[PDB]
Amino acid sequence: TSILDIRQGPKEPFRDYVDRFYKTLRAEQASQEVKNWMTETLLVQNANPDCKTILKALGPGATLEEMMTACQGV
Protein backbone atom coordinates (compact mmCIF):
# COMPACT_ATOMS: atom_id res chain seq x y z
CA THR A 1 0.00 0.00 0.00
CA SER A 2 1.21 3.50 -0.95
CA ILE A 3 1.54 6.46 1.60
CA LEU A 4 -1.05 8.51 -0.43
CA ASP A 5 -3.53 5.69 0.13
CA ILE A 6 -3.30 6.18 3.95
CA ARG A 7 -6.46 8.11 5.06
CA GLN A 8 -8.56 8.52 8.22
CA GLY A 9 -11.98 6.91 8.42
CA PRO A 10 -15.12 8.85 9.19
CA LYS A 11 -15.44 6.98 12.63
CA GLU A 12 -11.72 6.01 13.00
CA PRO A 13 -9.81 7.62 15.85
CA PHE A 14 -6.97 9.84 14.69
CA ARG A 15 -4.71 7.97 17.00
CA ASP A 16 -5.27 4.73 15.07
CA TYR A 17 -4.57 6.64 11.86
CA VAL A 18 -1.39 8.27 13.11
CA ASP A 19 -0.07 4.81 13.98
CA ARG A 20 -0.84 3.69 10.43
CA PHE A 21 0.93 6.77 9.09
CA TYR A 22 4.27 6.33 10.86
CA LYS A 23 4.18 2.56 10.07
CA THR A 24 3.88 3.32 6.31
CA LEU A 25 6.31 6.32 6.75
CA ARG A 26 8.52 3.65 8.49
CA ALA A 27 8.50 1.78 4.96
CA GLU A 28 9.34 4.92 3.07
CA GLN A 29 13.08 5.34 2.54
CA ALA A 30 13.09 9.16 1.25
CA SER A 31 15.35 12.04 2.49
CA GLN A 32 14.40 13.40 5.97
CA GLU A 33 13.39 16.84 4.53
CA VAL A 34 10.90 15.08 2.23
CA LYS A 35 9.63 12.96 5.04
CA ASN A 36 9.20 16.26 7.13
CA TRP A 37 7.19 17.64 4.21
CA MET A 38 5.04 14.49 4.26
CA THR A 39 4.49 14.81 7.98
CA GLU A 40 3.19 18.36 8.00
CA THR A 41 1.24 17.92 4.81
CA LEU A 42 -0.25 14.55 4.11
CA LEU A 43 -1.25 13.64 7.69
CA VAL A 44 -3.63 16.60 8.02
CA GLN A 45 -4.89 16.45 4.46
CA ASN A 46 -6.12 12.85 4.79
CA ALA A 47 -7.43 13.42 8.28
CA ASN A 48 -11.34 13.31 8.59
CA PRO A 49 -13.43 16.64 8.36
CA ASP A 50 -14.28 16.65 12.12
CA CYS A 51 -10.64 16.36 13.23
CA LYS A 52 -9.38 18.27 10.28
CA THR A 53 -11.44 21.19 11.51
CA ILE A 54 -9.82 20.69 15.03
CA LEU A 55 -6.28 20.59 13.62
CA LYS A 56 -6.79 23.71 11.59
CA ALA A 57 -7.47 25.51 15.03
CA LEU A 58 -4.15 24.28 16.51
CA GLY A 59 -2.29 26.46 13.88
CA PRO A 60 1.27 25.69 12.78
CA GLY A 61 4.13 24.87 15.14
CA ALA A 62 2.04 22.10 16.76
CA THR A 63 3.60 18.84 18.12
CA LEU A 64 2.31 15.27 18.20
CA GLU A 65 1.15 15.04 21.87
CA GLU A 66 -0.87 18.26 21.36
CA MET A 67 -2.36 16.96 18.06
CA MET A 68 -3.07 13.61 19.61
CA THR A 69 -4.76 15.12 22.70
CA ALA A 70 -6.48 17.68 20.44
CA CYS A 71 -8.44 15.15 18.35
CA GLN A 72 -9.30 12.72 21.21
CA GLY A 73 -13.07 13.30 21.51
CA VAL A 74 -13.63 13.14 17.78
Binding site: T1, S2, R26, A27, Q29
Partner: protein, 147 residues
Protein backbone atom coordinates in the same frame (compact mmCIF):
# COMPACT_ATOMS: atom_id res chain seq x y z
CA UNK B 1 31.23 -16.58 13.28
CA UNK B 2 34.68 -15.19 14.12
CA UNK B 3 34.81 -14.14 17.70
CA UNK B 4 37.50 -13.05 20.11
CA UNK B 5 38.81 -15.77 22.47
CA UNK B 6 39.82 -15.26 26.07
CA UNK B 7 43.62 -15.49 25.10
CA UNK B 8 43.01 -12.24 23.00
CA UNK B 9 42.92 -13.60 19.48
CA UNK B 10 40.21 -13.80 16.85
CA UNK B 11 39.09 -17.48 16.33
CA UNK B 12 36.14 -19.06 14.52
CA UNK B 13 33.28 -20.58 16.67
CA UNK B 14 30.13 -22.13 15.32
CA UNK B 15 26.71 -20.42 15.52
CA UNK B 16 24.29 -21.70 18.16
CA UNK B 17 21.10 -23.90 17.42
CA UNK B 18 18.77 -21.57 19.43
CA UNK B 19 20.39 -18.69 17.45
CA UNK B 20 19.60 -20.66 14.24
CA UNK B 21 16.08 -21.36 15.41
CA UNK B 22 15.62 -17.70 16.46
CA UNK B 23 16.51 -16.78 12.84
CA UNK B 24 13.99 -19.30 11.63
CA UNK B 25 11.25 -18.11 13.98
CA UNK B 26 11.70 -14.39 13.03
CA UNK B 27 11.12 -15.32 9.38
CA UNK B 28 8.18 -17.49 10.26
CA UNK B 29 6.50 -14.80 12.30
CA UNK B 30 7.30 -11.43 10.73
CA UNK B 31 7.90 -12.58 7.04
CA UNK B 32 8.89 -9.39 5.03
CA UNK B 33 8.21 -6.85 7.96
CA UNK B 34 10.97 -4.09 8.44
CA UNK B 35 11.90 -5.31 11.89
CA UNK B 36 13.45 -8.21 10.19
CA UNK B 37 16.43 -5.95 9.07
CA UNK B 38 17.74 -4.72 12.56
CA UNK B 39 16.97 -8.24 13.77
CA UNK B 40 19.10 -9.75 10.99
CA UNK B 41 21.81 -7.19 11.68
CA UNK B 42 22.08 -8.13 15.39
CA UNK B 43 22.07 -11.91 14.67
CA UNK B 44 24.69 -11.28 11.92
CA UNK B 45 27.18 -9.74 14.30
CA UNK B 46 30.61 -11.22 13.62
CA UNK B 47 29.17 -13.56 11.00
CA UNK B 48 30.97 -15.06 7.92
CA UNK B 49 29.73 -15.26 4.30
CA UNK B 50 29.56 -18.91 4.80
CA UNK B 51 27.22 -18.35 7.78
CA UNK B 52 25.19 -15.83 5.79
CA UNK B 53 24.65 -18.47 2.92
CA UNK B 54 23.67 -20.94 5.64
CA UNK B 55 21.01 -18.52 6.97
CA UNK B 56 19.67 -17.83 3.36
CA UNK B 57 19.76 -21.48 2.33
CA UNK B 58 17.95 -22.63 5.47
CA UNK B 59 14.85 -20.50 4.57
CA UNK B 60 11.57 -22.31 3.74
CA UNK B 61 8.84 -20.65 1.86
CA UNK B 62 8.74 -17.13 0.14
CA UNK B 63 10.66 -18.51 -2.85
CA UNK B 64 9.84 -15.72 -5.14
CA UNK B 65 11.55 -13.34 -2.72
CA UNK B 66 14.41 -15.78 -2.15
CA UNK B 67 15.03 -15.90 -5.86
CA UNK B 68 14.81 -12.01 -6.12
CA UNK B 69 17.39 -11.78 -3.37
CA UNK B 70 19.74 -14.27 -5.02
CA UNK B 71 19.62 -12.38 -8.23
CA UNK B 72 20.30 -9.07 -6.27
CA UNK B 73 23.23 -10.78 -4.49
CA UNK B 74 24.71 -11.81 -7.95
CA UNK B 75 24.00 -8.31 -9.35
CA UNK B 76 25.73 -6.63 -6.44
CA UNK B 77 28.57 -9.24 -6.75
CA UNK B 78 28.84 -8.54 -10.62
CA UNK B 79 29.07 -4.90 -9.66
CA UNK B 80 31.87 -5.72 -7.15
CA UNK B 81 33.90 -7.30 -9.88
CA UNK B 82 33.24 -4.46 -12.29
CA UNK B 83 34.25 -1.66 -9.82
CA UNK B 84 37.24 -3.46 -8.47
CA UNK B 85 39.33 -4.89 -11.33
CA UNK B 86 41.87 -7.73 -10.68
CA UNK B 87 45.32 -6.40 -9.73
CA UNK B 88 48.63 -6.17 -11.64
CA UNK B 89 50.65 -9.29 -12.38
CA UNK B 90 51.00 -12.60 -10.32
CA UNK B 91 50.01 -13.04 -6.70
CA UNK B 92 53.00 -12.52 -4.21
CA UNK B 93 54.17 -15.56 -2.09
CA UNK B 94 54.23 -13.27 0.93
CA UNK B 95 50.60 -12.20 0.41
CA UNK B 96 47.15 -13.51 0.04
CA UNK B 97 44.88 -12.90 -2.92
CA UNK B 98 42.34 -10.08 -3.31
CA UNK B 99 38.62 -11.21 -3.12
CA UNK B 100 36.14 -11.21 -5.98
CA UNK B 101 32.23 -10.83 -5.81
CA UNK B 102 31.94 -14.61 -5.49
CA UNK B 103 34.52 -14.72 -2.59
CA UNK B 104 32.32 -12.08 -0.87
CA UNK B 105 29.30 -14.19 -1.57
CA UNK B 106 31.30 -16.99 0.00
CA UNK B 107 31.02 -19.18 -3.07
CA UNK B 108 34.67 -19.26 -4.31
CA UNK B 109 36.26 -18.84 -0.96
CA UNK B 110 36.91 -21.36 1.77
CA UNK B 111 36.43 -20.67 5.52
CA UNK B 112 40.08 -20.48 6.24
CA UNK B 113 40.31 -18.01 3.41
CA UNK B 114 37.37 -15.99 4.90
CA UNK B 115 39.20 -16.03 8.31
CA UNK B 116 42.54 -14.94 6.52
CA UNK B 117 41.01 -11.77 5.10
CA UNK B 118 39.06 -10.69 8.24
CA UNK B 119 41.80 -11.60 10.84
CA UNK B 120 44.75 -10.40 8.85
CA UNK B 121 46.23 -6.84 9.22
CA UNK B 122 44.69 -4.66 7.52
CA UNK B 123 41.49 -6.63 7.68
CA UNK B 124 38.92 -6.49 4.87
CA UNK B 125 35.16 -6.41 5.78
CA UNK B 126 33.70 -8.85 3.31
CA UNK B 127 30.79 -9.51 5.85
CA UNK B 128 29.89 -5.84 5.80
CA UNK B 129 29.96 -5.73 1.96
CA UNK B 130 27.66 -8.76 1.72
CA UNK B 131 25.57 -7.25 4.59
CA UNK B 132 24.85 -4.07 2.56
CA UNK B 133 23.82 -6.26 -0.46
CA UNK B 134 21.50 -8.19 1.86
CA UNK B 135 20.12 -5.01 3.38
CA UNK B 136 19.77 -3.40 -0.12
CA UNK B 137 18.04 -6.50 -1.41
CA UNK B 138 15.92 -6.44 1.78
CA UNK B 139 14.78 -2.89 0.86
CA UNK B 140 13.83 -4.18 -2.65
CA UNK B 141 11.75 -6.88 -1.10
CA UNK B 142 10.14 -4.71 1.62
CA UNK B 143 9.19 -2.09 -1.09
CA UNK B 144 7.72 -4.71 -3.36
CA UNK B 145 5.96 -6.61 -0.64
CA UNK B 146 4.28 -3.51 0.69
CA UNK B 147 0.59 -3.80 -0.45
Amino acid sequence: PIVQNLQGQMVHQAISPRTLNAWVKVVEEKAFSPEVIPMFSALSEGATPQDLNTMLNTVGGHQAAMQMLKETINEEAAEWDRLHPVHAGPIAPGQMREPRGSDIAGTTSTLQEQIGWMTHNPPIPVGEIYKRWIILGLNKIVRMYSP
